[PDB]
């Protein structure tokens, strides 16, 4: 068993890839996830269509946009 | 032929701003007074 809040608490600091619901991808080190799962990522490259497209760096992603977040 | 209306306009904006030179000074003073305010002082002036 590994619930999403322990998974995200063990996921902090690691380079994670958040795919939004709308095709947007974000590769960055996960800094902080609250209980409402607003995610905060650092050194984030925004990847669209699997292609490195922008360097946004520090970023806050609101919760209701996240399709999934995975490790990479 | 082409830039006529803009050139006439550049003269009219000049002559009208000279005629309104007192009002232009009053706006500039009001902007400086509005800029320097606290929160409450700005809200009270916006009530007047």
């Amino acid at each position: 068993p590994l619930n999403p809040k322990p998974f995200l608490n063990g996921l902090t600091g690691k380079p994670v890839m958040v795919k939004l619901k709308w095709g947007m991808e974000y590769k960055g080190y996960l800094v902080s996830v609250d209980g409402y799962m607003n995610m905060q990522l650092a050194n984030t490259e925004e990847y669209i269509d699997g292609a490195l497209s922008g360097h946004l760096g520090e970023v806050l992603i609101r919760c209701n946009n996240v399709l999934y977040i995975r490790g990479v | 032929e082409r830039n006529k209306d803009i050139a006439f306009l550049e003269a009219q904006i000049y002559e009208y701003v000279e005629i309104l030179g007192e009002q232009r000074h009053l706006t500039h003073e009001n902007v400086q007074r509005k800029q320097a305010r606290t929160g409450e002082e700005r809200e009270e002036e916006e009530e007047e």
């Binding site: 902080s32 996830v33 905060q40 946004l56 760096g57 970023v59 609101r62 | -």
Partner: protein, 95 residues
Amino acid sequence: PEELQKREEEEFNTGPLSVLTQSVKNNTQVLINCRNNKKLLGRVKAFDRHCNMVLENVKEMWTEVPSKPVNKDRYISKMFLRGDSVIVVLRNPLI
């Protein structure tokens, strides 16, 4: 009450909305993606749990097809913004 007010300030200092906290700390602009694809470059005056925002000096840029689509932008001076329309808040924007 008061313990919730200390709790919310420490949570906004250490949690995900820290960057919004940072945007009200040293007064730097954030780049906010909206659900209608409008980017917002502007300082934040205040925020809350929902990421509702009160914003100053906002430049809203967006892309409009008439061909090639153009980057038509507008300057909204001061504004309020509902928080559910916010997609992505990035603290330091490049340009």
